Design a protein around this ligand. Sequence first.
Ligand SMILES: Nc1ncnc2c1ncn2[C@@H]1O[C@H](C[C@@H](N)CC[C@H](N)C(=O)O)[C@@H](O)[C@H]1O
Ligand SMILES: Nc1ncnc2c1ncn2[C@@H]1O[C@H](C[C@@H](N)CC[C@H](N)C(=O)O)[C@@H](O)[C@H]1O
Lengths: 242, 248
Amino acid sequence: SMLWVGVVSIFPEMFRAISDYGITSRAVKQGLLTLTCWNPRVYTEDRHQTVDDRPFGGGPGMVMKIKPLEGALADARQAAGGRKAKVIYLSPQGRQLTQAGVRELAEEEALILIAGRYEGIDERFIEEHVDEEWSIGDYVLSGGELPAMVLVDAVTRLLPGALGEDSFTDGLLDCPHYTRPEVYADKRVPEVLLSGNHEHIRRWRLQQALGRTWERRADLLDSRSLSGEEQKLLAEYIRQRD
Amino acid sequence: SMLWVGVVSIFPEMFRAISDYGITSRAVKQGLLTLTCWNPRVYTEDRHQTVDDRPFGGGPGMVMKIKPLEGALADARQAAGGRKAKVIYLSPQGRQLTQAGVRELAEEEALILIAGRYEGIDERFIEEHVDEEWSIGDYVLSGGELPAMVLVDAVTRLLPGALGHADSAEEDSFTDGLLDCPHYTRPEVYADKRVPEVLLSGNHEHIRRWRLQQALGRTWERRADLLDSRSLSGEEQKLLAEYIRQRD
Ligand SMILES: Nc1ncnc2c1ncn2[C@@H]1O[C@H](C[C@@H](N)CC[C@H](N)C(=O)O)[C@@H](O)[C@H]1O
Ligand SMILES: Nc1ncnc2c1ncn2[C@@H]1O[C@H](C[C@@H](N)CC[C@H](N)C(=O)O)[C@@H](O)[C@H]1O
């Protein structure tokens, strides 16, 4: 009800990974998320339910047939009802998904996600019916199923009351985490977390985040508008390190 | 056999998405891929102890204990045999996954992936047992299961004979620092849009030049950042300069 998601995929059973597990499964139960699949294989003319077709110009692999995708997409737009649905094609050619992109995506009421397969889908189908293209990263997968689930998972986290700051909220990585025992195999939990002083635990965590962000991902800080307080904790972290 | 994968996750049965469907399922059946799961909840002190416990220092959430993770890792290591195993924690604080990262990981004999849940895993588990932290992108997911699946699918595509006649790893996006070209299939005309004439009647050299130009132009248009890293030849410069001028 909060967000309606329709997935066009030839492996709808893969979506059990999000329908049966975690925040996405909980969001469905809580009525915040509606999840549906539209299998191009159901929209075929032949006895073996063929969705691929050879490519023009030669080259290796196969390409997805326009008609079976169009078939599955038409029914999905119909099932969206009167919701303003954004048609996304999962692709390595798309806008790289980042937390800022996830927030944008979380404002939508309806999403139709097209999961490609093989060498990909016909460019004319993209030109005709695809509102936007999104990539989950600079690597190549065998289908759009895992990317579509990554996108759904990330967005659902921002759905009010689904969870029950993050690693990319305010261009800063996350702090380390400690739990029982107090000491495990001669390795002990930092004293600052054993003390009970909220301001001291916040100060340390915020420094440890700034510290890891500068160590591993200095690029996330160039974009960042670091405060006078954050500029002191990062400086302290840098100079007090071997 | 070619690659052995062990996943450490509180949701082992979530991995049916890769073990039962697509290329990863075919690779498992063809003997190219071994895929095993290892629930940390089976290695706790006693049945009354959960995988998680309260976080030291307060704050919202729970944190995965070290002993259950240590137990599943130890058992997963034993099962790998005499294969040299690389131990990966999926984390957004890790090394950003890229096609080149995928090529490196494809050369590994064994991988043990650690999918974390909750708020995070205890920092002392990482310090003592993790060989590398890998991120799938600059966004936060609820668990490491989808990132672990993304990694296995990407790597499996590069195993000899895993793609068949469906696709080719030699011709992808990011392999040579460029995005892929558009793809076209039957019919020659659809929605008052005709397949580019070069694909319908051109020779191999014309098709190659059009495919390279498209890959360059699409890279220039959507991902200019990729061109900053990867230099262009005289031919590529001329194919690109011409793409740019003929855009509309
Ligand atoms: N990194 C990714 N980001 C979003 N979707 C992806 C990504 N990798 C693969 N896909 C999906 O997987 C499908 C099949 C891919 N093997 C085709 C990729 C295409 N030949 C290319 O190199 O760009 C694509 O049609 C996409 O739907
Ligand atoms: N972008 C990602 N790339 C690789 N793994 C991820 C990514 N996002 C989340 N994870 C996994 O999801 C697990 C736990 C999540 N609740 C992440 C929230 C956690 N507080 C954090 O900011 O890292 C992490 O331990 C990782 O295993």
